[PDB]
Symmetry: C2
């Protein structure tokens, strides 16, 4: 009954999505959240532990050597590019792999004293693929679940990983494997079937190497009521009536962190295609891209976007109208929801994404009586449930431009029908439904 | 008395500065304007001559190899970077020098049939340094004057040129050498005296290798009442609409060709210094930089464009707001009459090159202002115009905080001081206009005794 959640980082005591589902789950049956605390260079202090009623937060530190091999190298320079279909950015070196295993084993040993024979164990992202295997080696027979938040790549990409067979064997030490989308789940079952013979009943009960495990799809959601609440309050004063400076302007908006998977250079090119082929919008629209920086792997993306902002404004700008507002600034989350609400078009076009929550935040932030339009990549995991969005292939910049123009001229009637139907999807499958389905499936496993 | 003008390009059929000066000079006693037509191929075809009364425009074409060795390589990749104190951009190769010498001799041969014994000959920029020498080799004893439009570099820069000694010898075949500034003239005399014994009398009469020549300063000017006429006209429809949108914003303005000498990345960094150190201006000012498209597609100048695009993106990314973009960079052509109006309505004109013979944008800006309510000129001390525009706000562009402090001073300057500074610059520009410039040079050229 008691729940042990292990994630790459814990939250001190809402302000996000996955934190709400993990905390909603930990209050439902009590338990422990175990995770990295954020700091480095002093590892051997005892377990930082904070207790509040039903739940205990347990955290640790990491040496600089472990963090770079495990987290900066293997997790973020091998697994992350590969799972987002970018083998050309994979930098595999065997020391990083060995360090990835060493950190996973080291946190299995920190957690082992805190476990009880009855706990169900919930492990989160790709940083901790080997964690179950490390716990089984210590005799942990509990019900263990894994949830992958990013895509799982198809075999011809995944098997190019030098340690792909070890990764696959360790994934099968979990009793339950969760995925954002059905394509991710089937991708993993294909990679496994290329490596070993797999038995499947119903659709989601499996055996490989004699190990029994289930797979399932649990698309992660948001809490829509809180987004609507932050979105409908009034603005900062200086920002209160820039809504009032720009009454004559339609705003296309997007907010994304800088990453190769998000395809931000291609959005700029889609916006340039809109300016080149629909000149009737000149002086009457604006594209605003907010892209905070938080790693030198990501500055070459930042350099390219600065260049493309300058080039596009240089080419289509006027003495009194600049087409593209690019902001490399941090905005507080409660202001972004208001910007979502007042933006006529939300543009969410990553090249590969496990689940884009910005897309759901944008829909949950709209005024239902006068909502904006969501333009969504078909490679966003959210595209499988947000079918009434304007779905686009970001590799076709004219098709995205055509969707932007359609979004900018769409009648209120069709805006309401599309928004109401996406909102129903998001409300029915919210963050709280997500954690309940996963905990309910995890409990009913037999050890 | 009849005047022969040779320059690399000619104006066939005034919306310009030097075109207005050369044409005023030609119309005074008639004459000939001889130059390249701008076109490659069919170089052996006859001279295209157009005559209008007293004046003849005669042009030629060049072979594609002549354009590349003479103009793209030696003129624009050896002499231009070196004369702008950028030895690191010199790409000297001996075929380029030989093509530089071959084209000069080749245009001297094309021009020789057109000359008469009494003509005064006026040769213009750095493309034609050897031209006097080529005419003297063909026995031309006329009065020949040269005007250099760009700076003349100090000896430690000029002497790095592999052919610096031949260039100096041929310059001494002109009877009169004109320069933008006294520093250019003196730099040339330093280069010459470092190479050979030079005699100087009064201030500007010289001998070298037994050749006699004069030197003099003729800062090039503008036509102020034509600038003022274009500036005060009414706006085009879509640009009329937005002087009504630019009511609560002060505009800092600049318009320059893309070129390493102009220091456009350093202007951007000066603007970033203003935004970083005078936050009181946020949301209330704007810097607009117009950087036209270049005909010649000069690959060297597109690295500059890439650099500006990046810095425009970076500076707006860092200081922009959801409702305010600090920096408008436009890589577009704006018609010249519209620029004059933009000048007039701009609170601050920013002209800060790293090295410039004479920046005429500086004079156009002040000639464009409404005298009863003028904007402020911020000017680099390395612009040749800084020697006569002393009441501008003179700045050193290598100190970006000093440029920012001048911009902040320009944006908050009272009306009385703006009128005082502007009135004194306008007087300088009206007294030394483009027509005064060509009259001073031809009058000095004429009184030379062959």
């Amino acid at each position: 009954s008691r729940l042990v959640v292990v994630s790459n980082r814990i939250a001190p005591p809402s302000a996000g999505g996955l934190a709400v589902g993990i905390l909603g789950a930990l209050k439902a049956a009590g338990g422990l959240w175990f995770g990295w605390s954020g700091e480095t260079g002093n590892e051997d202090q005892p377990l930082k532990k904070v207790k509040k009623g039903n739940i205990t937060w347990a955290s640790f530190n990491l040496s600089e050597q472990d963090l770079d091999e495990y987290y900066n190298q293997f997790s973020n320079a091998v697994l992350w590019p590969a799972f987002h279909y970018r083998l050309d950015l994979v930098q595999f070196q065997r020391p990083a792999w060995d360090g990835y295993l060493r950190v996973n084993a080291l946190l299995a040993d920190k957690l082992l004293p805190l476990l009880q024979d009855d706990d169900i164990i919930w492990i989160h992202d790709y940083h901790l693929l080997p964690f179950a295997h490390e716990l089984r080696k210590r005799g942990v027979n509990n019900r263990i679940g894994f949830f992958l938040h990013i895509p799982f790549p198809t075999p011809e990409i995944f098997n190019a990983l030098p340690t792909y067979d070890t990764l696959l064997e360790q994934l099968c030490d979990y009793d339950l494997l969760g995925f954002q989308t059905e394509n991710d789940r089937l991708a993993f079952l294909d990679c496994l079937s290329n490596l070993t013979r797999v038995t499947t009943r119903s659709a989601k009960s499996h055996t490989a190497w004699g190990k029994a495990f289930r797979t399932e799809v649990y698309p992660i959601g948001i809490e829509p009521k809180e987004i609507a609440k932050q979105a409908a309050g009034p603005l900062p004063p200086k920002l209160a009536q820039l809504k009032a400076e720009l009454k004559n302007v339609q705003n296309i908006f997007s907010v994304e962190r800088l990453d190769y998977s998000k395809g931000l250079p291609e959005r700029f090119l889609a916006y340039e295609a809109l300016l080149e082929k629909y000149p009737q919008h000149h002086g009457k629209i604006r594209y605003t891209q907010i892209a905070p920086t938080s790693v030198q792997a990501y500055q070459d993306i930042r350099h390219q976007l600065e260049n493309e902002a300058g080039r596009i404004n240089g080419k289509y700008g006027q003495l009194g109208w600049t087409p593209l507002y690019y902001l490399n600034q941090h905005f507080d989350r409660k202001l972004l929801m208001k910007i979502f609400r007042y933006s006529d078009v939300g543009l969410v076009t990553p090249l590969r994404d496990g689940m884009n929550l910005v897309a759901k935040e944008y829909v949950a932030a709209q005024d239902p009586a006068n909502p904006g339009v969501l333009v969504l990549s078909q490679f966003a995991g959210a595209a499988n449930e947000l079918t009434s969005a304007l779905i686009v292939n970001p590799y076709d910049r004219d098709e995205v431009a055509a969707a932007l123009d359609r979004a900018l001229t769409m009648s209120l009637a069709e805006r309401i029908s599309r928004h109401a139907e996406m909102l129903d999807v998001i409300v029915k499958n919210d963050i709280n439904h997500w954690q309940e389905c996963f905990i309910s499936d995890l409990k009913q496993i037999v050890p």
